[PDB]
């Protein structure tokens, strides 16, 4: 046996029992002809193939699939035709692959979700009450205070992660809970205990639907109802413990000491190795389907024998969660710091200006260009890498609708500033000090501010690119193409006046050009440089006399604002599909 323990219920659904029914649904990619009705208190497992390309049956039922469309039939939820609003208000979909933030605790993870799902009229005591009820129901009081981390591997077990993934859906008290592959990656005992947990959730006035391919013997015995499919064609719908009798009474026995789910699935499976076998097996499957439809023709249900949080509160919650998670992730912060410091020290030492012969004009200009141009190399890769790692969470959270793109947009941009500013300090200050650049507070501060704005613009560009292209490598390619274009158009490597129309237009919007020109108008503004030679004419010769320094700052701000508009439109209009 496995294990017996407390089977009490702690968090039950308080509303009227809900229903879900499907009437002659025909979906092609797909699903040929399904009819069923289930009610609160039952648990329906779906076994066999049952799906379609890149979308399971449960995604078809919730009305959010891909690569196909519903051709006929109806889906009804709580007596009403299915719609995106009924799905959002009733269906707690738990996906096969999602992630929780690595460095929050269970209490913190549930607390942040609770703040974003429960009505704004709840007091904090009521939200803490709800979180504790969910923790009690899922048997998480022991290990409630540990890390939910996946990337942080040390922490709570995979079973407990699965339970937390269920809890973040249970918090808003759903009536219909739908799970896709709940026992995936779990051990035998863990999967068994998880299925019993799902049974208790069903017991507490809820409807639970489970998509489960190839269930084990001991898991099959725990099922209340089972829907057996070979393809989109159903074979049997009804009580799991009577499934064998159904087949035995229609001429297809099953041996003792053979799992019913595996044997029947293999018996009705449609091999495509040859045309003769595929033809014979499709004919067999259609015969069994017609036979079932006849068997339950005269039997009912085809079964054999509140104000929400506003944008500001959502923003506040997202910014606190983002800052809380990333500032506990110390290895990444140390790596980013170490890379910025080592790079700034190498640039500083190469252009060292204290214990040496004073830097030439052209060496100083090369230095200022290198200070600007050599930074995006790491910034682009880490912003794109981080954005791609977060698409699963963003996609499913926006799909569920606990927040809109506005609060996420602002929280995402603002949350990197406590790391960005430290990064700018570490990168900026050792080069300005090691290479003997212009003394005084005002040059130093103007240099720092210009570098800060340019790197910010770079981050917004990479952020907009990562959210626009469907994959990591295409977004990386696009970002490097813009970076290399801006680099060449920067005006140091090639002359700005000796340009064809389109490179001139590229130079006009190149943030590395404005970075270079600004730094040059700080180091050589009104200072006399020993070559004496007036700085103003020297800047004029290189065609850097026009556009006063404040306009350079405004232009960099404008370019960042442009990429912000692109990023916002990108996220809202184009879906951030995972992987």
């Amino acid at each position, epitope marked *: 046996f496995s294990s017996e323990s407390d089977n009490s219920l702690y968090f039950t659904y308080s509303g009227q029992p809900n229903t879900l029914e499907v009437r002659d649904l025909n979906y092609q990619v797909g699903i040929q002809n399904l009819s069923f009705k289930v009610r609160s208190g039952q648990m329906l497992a779906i076994i066999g193939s049952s799906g379609c390309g890149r979308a399971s049956l449960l995604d078809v039922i919730t009305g959010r699939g891909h690569g196909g469309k519903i051709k006929s039939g109806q889906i009804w939820i709580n007596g009403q035709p299915s719609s995106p609003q009924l799905v959002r208000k009733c269906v707690a979909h738990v996906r096969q692959h999602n992630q929780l933030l690595p460095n929050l605790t269970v209490r913190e993870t549930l607390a942040f979700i609770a703040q974003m799902r429960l009505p704004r009229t709840f007091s904090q*005591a009521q939200r803490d*009450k709800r979180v504790e*009820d969910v923790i009690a129901e899922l048997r998480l009081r022991q290990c409630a205070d540990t890390r939910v981390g996946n990337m942080y591997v040390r922490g709570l077990s995979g079973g407990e992660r699965r339970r937390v993934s269920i809890g973040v859906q249970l918090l808003w008290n759903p009536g219909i809970l739908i799970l896709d592959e709940p026992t995936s990656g779990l051990d035998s005992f863990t999967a068994h205990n998880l299925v019993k947990t799902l049974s208790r959730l069903a017991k507490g006035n809820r409807l639970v639907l489970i998509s489960l391919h190839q269930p084990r013997s001991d898991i099959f015995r725990l099922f209340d109802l089972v829907l057996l499919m070979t393809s989109g064609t159903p074979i049997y719908l009804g009580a799991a413990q009577h499934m064998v009798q159904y087949f035995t009474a229609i001429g297809y026995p099953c041996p003792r000491y053979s799992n019913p789910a595996d044997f029947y699935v293999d018996l009705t499976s449609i091999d495509r190795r040859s045309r003769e076998q595929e033809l014979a097996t499709r004919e067999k499957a259609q015969s069994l389907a017609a036979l079932f439809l006849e068997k339950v023709r005269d039997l009912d249900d085809f079964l054999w024998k509140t104000k929400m949080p506003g944008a500001v509160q959502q923003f506040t919650t997202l910014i606190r969660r983002q800052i809380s998670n990333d500032f506990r992730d110390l290895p990444t912060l140390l790596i980013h710091g170490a890379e910025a410091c080592l790079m700034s020290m190498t640039i500083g030492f190469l252009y060292f200006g204290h214990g040496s012969i004073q830097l030439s004009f052209m060496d100083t200009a090369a230095l200022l260009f290198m200070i600007g141009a050599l930074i995006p190399f790491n910034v682009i890769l880490d912003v794109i890498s981080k954005c791609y790692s977060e698409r699963a969470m963003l996609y499913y959270e926006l799909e569920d609708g606990l927040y809109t793109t506005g609060p996420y947009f602002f929280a995402k941009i603002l949350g990197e500033l406590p790391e960005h500013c430290a990064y700018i300090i570490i990168y900026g200050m050792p080069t300005y000090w090691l290479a003997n650049l212009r003394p005084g507070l005002q040059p130093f501060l103007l240099h720092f501010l210009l570098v800060w704005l340019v790197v910010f613009c770079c981050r917004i560009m990479a952020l907009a690119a990562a959210a626009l292209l469907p994959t990591f490598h295409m977004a990386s390619f696009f970002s490097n193409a813009l970076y290399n274009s801006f680099y060449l158009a920067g005006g140091f490597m090639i002359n700005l006046s000796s340009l064809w129309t389109v490179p001139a237009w590229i130079s006009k919007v190149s943030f590395l050009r404005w970075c270079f020109e600004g730094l040059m108008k700080i180091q050589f503004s009104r200072r006399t440089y020993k070559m004496a030679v007036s700085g103003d004419k020297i800047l004029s010769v290189m065609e850097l006399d026009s556009y006063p320094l404040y306009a350079i700052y405004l232009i960099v701000i404008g370019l960042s604002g442009g990429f912000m508009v692109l990023y916002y439109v990108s996220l809202r209009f184009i879906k951030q599909k995972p992987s």
Partner: antibody, heavy 122, light 108 residues
């Protein structure tokens, strides 16, 4: 108005069984958790168990698992409790009560019944 | 199980005075402690929900608090009607447990 109305007093012989009732009014009885409590003179109160009528689920106090059977008839909004194999130590006042929370985990019994005296004596 | 213990089963008080009734838990109950007032012949009335939250309809004379595992019910300006048996009950974890009760009496 929320109100719980219990059965009258009872007097039975040892070895027999009794069945008490608690009719609820003023709320959606079916989906709320209702609990039962024993008050034995000379002592405090003892928790017997909680019952969830829509599903028929019982949260047991292990002391009373083999003695008190809890049930309900949702078509008449009445909870019942049956006491089996009575002895002299089961003579007490029994109460039914409902919780503040429609969800069931917090035993803050907002509304209470009247008490059903049970006397066991030959 | 978590045992709730109420010492001082009788407190001799006078009308118009101050009464403090204590109760300690054998384990962490996370402030999920209710207080009940029972008079002879009547079913108990709930006075306090979670440790400090006063129930609707209960006079402002009643209050409560706690720290760690030690909780107190206080009554300011004790009335004749407030002479009753008070119970401490925890709902953190099943089985639910009640204290032994304390009873007030008029000092003579």
């Amino acid at each position: 108005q929320v109100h719980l109305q219990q059965s009258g007093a009872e007097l039975v012989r040892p070895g027999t069984s009794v069945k008490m009732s608690c009719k609820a009014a003023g709320y959606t009885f079916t989906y709320w958790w209702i609990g039962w409590l024993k008050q034995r003179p000379g002592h405090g109160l003892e928790w017997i168990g909680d019952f969830f009528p829509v599903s028929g689920h019982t949260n047991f106090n292990e002391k009373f698992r083999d003695k008190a059977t809890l049930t309900a008839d949702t078509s008449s909004s009445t909870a019942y409790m049956q006491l089996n194999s009575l002895t002299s130590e089961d003579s007490a006042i029994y109460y039914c009560a409902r919780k503040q929370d429609s969800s069931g985990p917090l035993y803050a019994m907002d509304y209470w019944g009247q008490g059903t005296s049970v006397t066991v004596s030959s | 199980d978590i045992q709730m213990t109420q010492s001082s089963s009788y407190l001799s008080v006078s009308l118009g005075g101050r009464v403090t009734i204590t109760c300690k838990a054998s384990d962490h109950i996370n402030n999920w402690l209710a207080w009940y007032q029972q008079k002879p012949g009547n079913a108990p009335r709930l006075l306090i929900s979670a440790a400090t939250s006063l129930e609707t309809g209960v006079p402002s004379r009643f209050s409560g608090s706690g720290s760690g595992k030690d909780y107190t019910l206080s009554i300011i300006s004790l009335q004749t009607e407030d002479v009753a048996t008070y119970y401490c009950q925890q709902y953190w974890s099943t089985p639910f447990t009640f204290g032994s009760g304390t009873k007030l009496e008029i000092k003579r």
